[PDB]
Amino acid sequence: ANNPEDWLSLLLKLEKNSVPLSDALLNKLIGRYSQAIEALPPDKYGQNESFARIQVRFAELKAIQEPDDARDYFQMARANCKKFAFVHISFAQFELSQGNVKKSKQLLQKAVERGAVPLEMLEIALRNLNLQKKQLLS
Numbered sequence: 001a002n003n004p005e006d007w008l009s010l011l012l013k014l015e016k017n018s019v020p021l022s023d024a025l026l027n028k029l030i031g032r033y034s035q036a037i038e039a040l041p042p043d044k045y046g047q048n049e050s051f052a053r054i055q056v057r058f059a060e061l062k063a064i065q066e067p068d069d070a071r072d073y074f075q076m077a078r079a080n081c082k083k084f085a086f087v088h089i090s091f092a093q094f095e096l097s098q099g100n101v102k103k104s105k106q107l108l109q110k111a112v113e114r115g116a117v118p119l120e121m122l123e124i125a126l127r128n129l130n131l132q133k134k135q136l137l138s
């Protein structure tokens, strides 16, 4: 059916079956996530956890495919699913990987200020940022 859960499930299955990964299978994977986004209206799904994972997966895959273009996809996921800490952290991780440390901190702090959940995740990420690690989570 047409809901984030069945979509997310079929997407993860596609990833598991796309190993080992080539540019061609990566492209196919990304196109499939875009088809999910075309079918799932954001305003119904702003607090749906599967929908949020779909948006973050699409951004992360685009981050691999073409980093200098992916930012707008991370912003889209944050605008659509602002309640979830993992969304903001994902954005902060991408900015960090680009050397954009000040922007990475602002994302984490804005999320704390806006009450994104769970708070523990934001605190760990911010701890790691200040310990100057490469990964906000592990």
Ligand SMILES: [Pb+2]
Residues within 6 Å of the ligand: 041, 043, 044
């Ligand atoms: Pb609508």
